Design a protein around this nucleic acid. Structure first.
Ligand SMILES: Nc1ncnc2c1ncn2[C@H]1C[C@H](O)[C@@H](COP(=O)(O)OP(=O)(O)OP(=O)(O)O)O1
Ligand SMILES: [Mg+2]
Lengths: 402, 538
DNA sequence: AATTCCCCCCCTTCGGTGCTTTGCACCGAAGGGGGGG
């Protein structure tokens, strides 16, 4: 047993349980009955003042319910980080891999008992349909799934398990985040599954992303033969905003054509100086911005914008106007008739990319009303982690990310 | 008697001691029941006499139960509640009759002396000391401490609920075909067995409860319909609210209006069409609770309508899991919506209203989405599933709104019902400049010190107009400049502004706002056919 | 001037927070009320 303590001066999670549908409640009741029979959780009373939300998810093509606990507040208050928990913060070679496979190894956490003084912080409540009975309270006896300290305590056992495999295959990079194992190899697309199956058999005995296909989206400019006053006004505003990201944006000879009141529809012939300036500005726009570097101390912020027609844009950055990554997530088909599902899938994809690249989940600025998200996000979630998020209520300007 | 169940360990907050409050004087009528009550409990061992070794005290008083002949003894444990450890409440909501199913046999049971049957932690008993003052004066009062759960202590409800759950669990485990709704000490027991077998099982349950010291007196045991359960009357195939009495006064004070609004909100769960906005509009800006508020004409009409609604008797039906949930929404005007949840037409499972105004500026589509969200949450709470919605909005309108909006918004599986007033967007902004229209470059500024500003426009034809503004702001000046452009233009206009605030407000297509200027802008925007609004940096 | 507790709801008010144009918009907690025990 490894003693665990909260961060100095912190109290503990006291988050309320949100209502659940009937199928989720039935699945949670069955799962928790089995877990309490096996001794993994134990019933508690109201004298425990701590609580964390719980719900259930059906993983991608699984047809099996899985209990998920929102340990975000307990994670933000736990100190167990002396143990990097990752075996060196982040393998910097995982991002330059042909294929990365994510495996769920959280069940292995259910064999390590949790420290007795820390169990009270892992309490959760199962609600009832129509409030027929008071909610049933449980607390964890073993290492829970979703708590950041669980990989930090199983880290020694995890390293011991993977040594017979990692030493034999030195060209495979293995990373661990929460209950997920990321296995990245540069081998053939089928040999990769062969090695993954061998690793799965090795794990069973002991008790697919493509990061090279990830490309940033640079800020582009319209290509037109005849330019109207409206087009120049829209371009000048775009270049003025982009000047905050790329120092050296001139846009001074383009604003001369915007002098004097003029009709928005009539065309303006660009002067040679304006044309040169625009060509130079486009040249500056196709190169990546220098002087921006990842800071391990600071946290990551991910902004998402909806461009319509099933398109979303995202920017991951630590400081304003210094984007570590920019990208676009597109899943339209027939518009999918569901914006919440698209946003949930985009959030999961961005979090997976962030974990692969920097080893940290970002804080999301979701472009959605809070109530809609809290109502519907659990119906489409399929990941064992939950990133921190905040909701924006201010509409962005004319979007320059396209 | 006293339950043989195990006590819940309770401790004070770290570094804090027990209360030492002094008993306030009590009336002689009160100090005849407490002395009568404390004598009885002391006989059953629910309270214990203490001496000078206990330095703690807490005021006690008594109120009258719903029986109007018995007295409920309470302790003002606020000081002890401050220094008591935190608990987690296990009561997550209130059961609703609409979530009940059809049961052939139904009974309702009440536990007599609920709290006084559950033991209290031995180490915490000394902090519950209290004194019963002597009649008149002299002969210092008798000092007692609680051996059971006190009424007025912040830990009593959760402890009693957990104890009752533990007591009931062995019975429910071996009788899975019986529904037991448990709220505090109130038990609704329903089953599909015949009346004889149901009564035999009820006797078995009563014996099981008595084995744990929980007595169920025959006075509070109901065996025939209608059943008074949790504020409702339950019949074999319908349910109603217990009769709601609205005041019929001539002069209304603030407290009276608050009581009436609360009662109407309670009645709105089964009576359809209840409107409360006009009455609640009288509660803003008034400080004193006893201040007399004259009833406005709009409030009087709404009160008359509500009195008309409550005159006829309405009933709700029970849930049928084999059928489908349908929630129909109607617009009521001025940001008010009603909804009915039912499985069969003209047989409401329940009713409700949504009249919450969120945001300074909003339209009907956003409010409809909020109402749908509220109904979805309430339906998930009650029945555990989302209903199918019948909304008074066309599919094309919703498609346009949700595809052109900058936020991720959604409405679950719904169908269009043609019941006016319909929900629609009153104007649309062109995505491209209008050829042949007139272009208004609008500007607006205001110094922050003097609180004076200007707001005007220049058009490509050569017309200018500037109007000084007093006691305004930069945002207000920009909005006023846009208003000037809308006012002085034709039926088509191309407005170019330097304000992100005004553009962000207008692009959301509001139709109601808390600002009068935005309302005038909306009225002007509705009149025009094509409006193109563009942003240009200063 | 009678003094209590916990739970859910609605409606109004006020302070805190964030981005910005240091005002304006949004949100959560606390006051009142209703209902339950
Ligand atoms: N006004 C109140 N103040 C504090 N606690 C209360 C109050 N009303 C009810 N309770 C709590 C304590 C009660 O023991 C418990 C059950 O309510 P209730 O049945 O009305 O009382 P009871 O069980 O003590 O009396 P009875 O013998 O009349 O059933 O709920
Ligand atoms: Mg009782």
């Amino acid at each position: 047993t490894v003693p665990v303590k909260l961060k100095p001066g912190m109290d503990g999670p006291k988050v309320k349980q949100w209502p659940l549908t009937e199928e989720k409640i039935k699945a949670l009741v069955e799962i928790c009955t089995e877990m309490e029979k096996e001794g993994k959780i134990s019933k508690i009373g109201p004298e425990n003042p701590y609580n964390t939300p719980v719900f259930a998810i059906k993983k991608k093509d699984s047809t099996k319910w899985r209990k998920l606990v929102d340990f975000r507040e307990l994670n933000k208050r736990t100190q167990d980080f002396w143990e990097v928990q990752l075996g060196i913060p982040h393998p910097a070679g995982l991002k330059k891999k042909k294929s990365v496979t994510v495996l769920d190894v959280g069940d292995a956490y259910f064999s390590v008992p949790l420290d007795e003084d820390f169990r009270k912080y892992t309490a959760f409540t199962i609600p009832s349909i129509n409030n027929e009975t008071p909610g049933i309270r449980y607390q964890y006896n073993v290492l829970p799934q979703g708590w950041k300290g669980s990989p930090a305590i199983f880290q020694s056992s995890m390293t011991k398990i993977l040594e017979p495999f990692k030493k034999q295959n030195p060209d495979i990079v293995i990373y661990q985040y929460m209950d997920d194992l990321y296995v990245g190899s540069d081998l053939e697309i089928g040999q990769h599954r062969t090695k993954i199956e061998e690793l799965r058999q090795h794990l069973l005995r002991w008790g697919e992303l493509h990061p090279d296909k990830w490309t940033v989206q640079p800020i582009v400019l319209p290509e037109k033969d005849s330019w109207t006053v409206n087009d120049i006004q829209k371009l000048v505003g775009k270049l003025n905003w982009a000047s905050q990201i790329y120092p050296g944006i001139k846009v001074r000879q383009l604003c001369k054509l915007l002098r004097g009141t003029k009709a928005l529809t009539e065309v303006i012939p660009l002067t040679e100086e304006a044309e040169l300036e625009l060509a130079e500005n486009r040249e500056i726009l196709k190169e990546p911005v220098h002087g921006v570097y990842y800071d391990p101390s600071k946290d990551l912020i991910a902004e998402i914008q909806k461009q319509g027609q099933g398109q979303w844009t995202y920017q991951i950055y630590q400081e304003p106007f210094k984007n570590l990554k920019t990208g676009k997530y597109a899943r339209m088909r027939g518009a999918h008739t569901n914006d919440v599902k698209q946003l949930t899938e985009a959030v999961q994809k961005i979090t997976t990319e962030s974990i692969v690249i920097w080893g940290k989940t970002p804080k999301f600025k979701l472009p959605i009303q809070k109530e809609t998200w809290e109502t519907w996000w659990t119906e489409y979630w399929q990941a064992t982690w939950i990133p921190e998020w905040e909701f924006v209520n201010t509409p962005p300007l004319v979007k320059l990310w396209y | 008697p006293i339950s043989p169940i195990e006590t819940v360990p309770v401790k004070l907050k770290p570094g804090m001691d027990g209360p030492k409050v002094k008993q306030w004087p009590l009336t002689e009528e009160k100090i005849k029941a407490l002395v009568e009550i404390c004598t009885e409990m002391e006989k059953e061992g629910k309270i214990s006499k203490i001496g000078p070794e206990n330095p703690y005290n807490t005021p006690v008083f008594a109120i009258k139960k719903k029986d109007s002949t018995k007295w409920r003894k309470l302790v003002d444990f606020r000081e002890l509640n401050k220094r008591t450890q935190d608990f987690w409440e296990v009561q997550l909501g209130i059961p609703h009759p609409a979530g009940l199913k059809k049961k052939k046999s139904v009974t309702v049971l009440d536990v007599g002396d609920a709290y006084f049957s559950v033991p209290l932690d031995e180490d915490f008993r000394k902090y519950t000391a209290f004194t019963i003052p002597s009649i008149n004066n002299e002969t210092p009062g008798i000092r007692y401490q609680y051996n059971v759960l006190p009424q007025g202590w912040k830990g009593s409800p959760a402890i009693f609920q957990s104890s009752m759950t533990k007591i009931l669990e062995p019975f429910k485990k071996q009788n899975p075909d019986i529904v037991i709704y448990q709220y505090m000490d109130d038990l609704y027991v329903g089953s599909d067995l015949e009346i004889g077998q149901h009564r035999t099982k009820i006797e078995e349950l009563r014996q099981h409860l008595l084995r744990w010291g929980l007595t169920t007196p025959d006075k509070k045991h109901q065996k025939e319909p209608p059943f008074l359960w949790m504020g409702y009357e339950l019949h074999p195939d319908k349910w109603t609210v217990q009769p709601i009495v609205l005041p019929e006064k001539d002069s209304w004070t603030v407290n009276d209006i608050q009581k009436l609004v609360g009662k109407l909100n309670w009645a709105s769960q089964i009576y359809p069409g209840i409107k409360v906005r006009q009455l609640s509009k009288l509660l803003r800006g008034t400080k004193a609770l006893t201040e007399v508020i004259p009833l406005t004409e709009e409030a009087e009409l709404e009160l008359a309508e509500n009195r008309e609604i409550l005159k006829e008797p309405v009933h709700g039906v029970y849930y049928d899991p084999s059928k489908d949930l349908i929630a129909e929404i109607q617009k009521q005007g001025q940001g008010q919506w009603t909804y009915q949840i039912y499985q069969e037409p003209f047989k409401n499972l329940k009713t409700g209203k949504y009249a919450r105004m969120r945001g300074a500026h909003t339209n009907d589509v956003k409010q409809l989405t909020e109402a749908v969200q509220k109904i979805t949450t309430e339906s998930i709470v009650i029945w555990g599933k989302t209903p199918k919605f019948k909304l008074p909005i066309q599919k094309e309108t919703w498609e346009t709104w949700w595809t052109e909006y900058w936020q991720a918004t959604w409405i679950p599986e719904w169908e269009f019902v043609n019941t006016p007033p319909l929900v629609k967007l009153w104007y649309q902004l062109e995505k491209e400049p209008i050829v042949g229209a007139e272009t208004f470059y609008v500007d607006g500024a205001a110094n922050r010190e003097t609180k004076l500003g200007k707001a005007g426009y220049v058009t490509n034809k050569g017309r200018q107009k500037v109007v000084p503004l007093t006691n305004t702001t930069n945002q207000k000046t920009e909005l006023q400049a846009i208003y000037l452009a809308l006012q002085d233009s034709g039926l088509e206009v191309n407005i170019v502004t330097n304000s992100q605030y005004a553009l962000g407000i207008i692009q959301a297509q509001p139709d109601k706002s808390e600002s009068e200027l935005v309302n005038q802008i909306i009225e002007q925007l509705i009149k025009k056919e094509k409006v193109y609004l563009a942003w240009v940096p200063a």
